[PDB]
Structures are given as C-alpha cells and as structure tokens.
C-alpha cells in the first residue's frame, strides 16, 4: 500500500508512505536517521507523494515531480523510461534515489559529507535533514528548519525484540560441558513437563538448515535482537531431537510461534546458540556443537514467566526490555 496521486497528502496518508520508504531503504542499508532526514525534506517538497506534480501542474515536465520534486521532472521520468520502470511509482522513485547515491549524482558536498556518507550517518535526524537540504535540494530559500522538525517527528513516530527463552520450564538433564556428550560445548539438554513438550520462537527467525540425519533444524534471527545480558546482536541456534522435523529450510516464524517439541529424534531438547547471522555447520571439541562463537543460553535468552525447576545454578535472568 502506497498513496500515489497529484494531490497533497494528509498526515495519515504521509505516515503510510513514510513507513513504506523506511522499510524499503532500511533493507537497502540506509540508517533510520538519514531516511528520516530525507523524509523531513520530502514532506516539505511533496507531502511524501510520489505522484505529485509541482503546484499540482500535471504533465508539466519542466517543473518538479514526485517525492523530492525532481526538477525538471523529465530528468527522472527519462531515467525511469531508460530503466524500464513506470515513472509514477513509489519504488521507481526510491530506485532513482539509490541510483543517485550509487552514481555520484544530484548531491553536492557543501556540508563535508558525501551522499554515500549521508546514508550511513547516525547524526540526529534534525542535523541530517539540514545537510540533505543544503546538499541535495539546494533551495533558493535555505531557511527551512521545519524540515528538521519533521525529520525528528518521523524518527519518533515510525517503526528490538527481546530474545525470549523458548520453553515454559527450565529443567536441565545435561548442562554446558556435561560429561556424557557436551564436553567443550555450551549446549544444554532440556526436558519438558512431559514427553514431546512444545517450545516457541524466541524472536522473528528463519529456518536456515535442516539435518535429517541428526534430527536438527537451524534458525537465524531475522534482525538483531536484545539479549538477556543487555547485548544487541544477531543470533543463530540449533534445535535437536524433534521427530519428525516440523519445518523446512526457509520457514519463517514470528516471535512466540511454535518452533518445535522435545523428542527422541530419553525425550528432550538439545539447544545450542552462537553469535551472528551465519550458520557454519558443526564441530567436535571433543563433543559435538555448532561451529562459530557459542554463547551462553542464559545470557542470550530471558526467562520472564519461566518456571525454573533445574536450574544447574546458571545466571538465568529476566529482562524488562519492551519489544518494538
Ligand atoms: Zn545435548
């Protein structure tokens, strides 16, 4: 959903557009600050409307058009045609801006910042709105602090999850460095209240590997998460012993969705988590665990609303972090 028209948008309609642009350019590696600094500008140029002609003068290609009011409009519209993109279109316009960053276009460095620098900046959305104004837009009237106020407003009004321990109970049958099969590892075997006991997604995640032989699924958090130890990081983990395996590679789960059950794939759940967003298969040291940097389960996942029955004397922590 985007609002595209030759008419001034209300704040409700702009908010929808502003959210869309945030989502799109976020995936393209721009910072929330720089996107909002641009939004403050596009609010003044266009009410964040990709279909808007300057002064509502439809079809006048000598005047401004679209989100940043490309002037003359034909420079953009012609670029769009050459690129096989429909010109009056949100994504096409965002693709034009990305192109300008990638091709040393539009921007003039008047504030000791290049366009490539701009999109990675974490200066205030106010600061960056004014940098954008001076460098990209270059208006005849430079005194427009409202673009800054608008930037900071979109920063606050648009758009971390706390990693929650998957299961309702903690009851450890074999901890980190356990003698039977965890020597050298930070793995933990957990049992449920019964056989085949459910556990849930600690955060939005995706299934990245399936080992049918060894009965494991591997998962990677979609975003960086907030950990029980106050760390912010991507995480990757493995669930072993479920039978049959619930999902396939690519499967997407939201925080709290059913992720698996204990099993015999004695009934239990072997769990192991590493730092980062890269699954790297396995190693033995001397016992089997994930390759990569193992993290303590009790430092990563919070135990809010978990019944601890055993325990193993680990620093299990609750967290007051509130999910975005
Ligand atoms: Zn184990």
Curated annotation (Swiss-Prot):
Broad EC category: hydrolase
Domain of life the protein comes from: Viruses
Stretches the record annotates as Probable metalloendopeptidase: 160-324
Cited InterPro entries: Dup_hybrid_motif, Phage_lysozyme2
Cellular-component GO terms for this entry: virus tail, tip
Cofactor note: Binds 1 zinc ion per subunit.
One Pfam family of this chain: Phage_lysozyme2
Active site, renumbered: 45
UniProt name for this protein: Morphogenesis protein 1
Recorded name of the encoding gene: 13
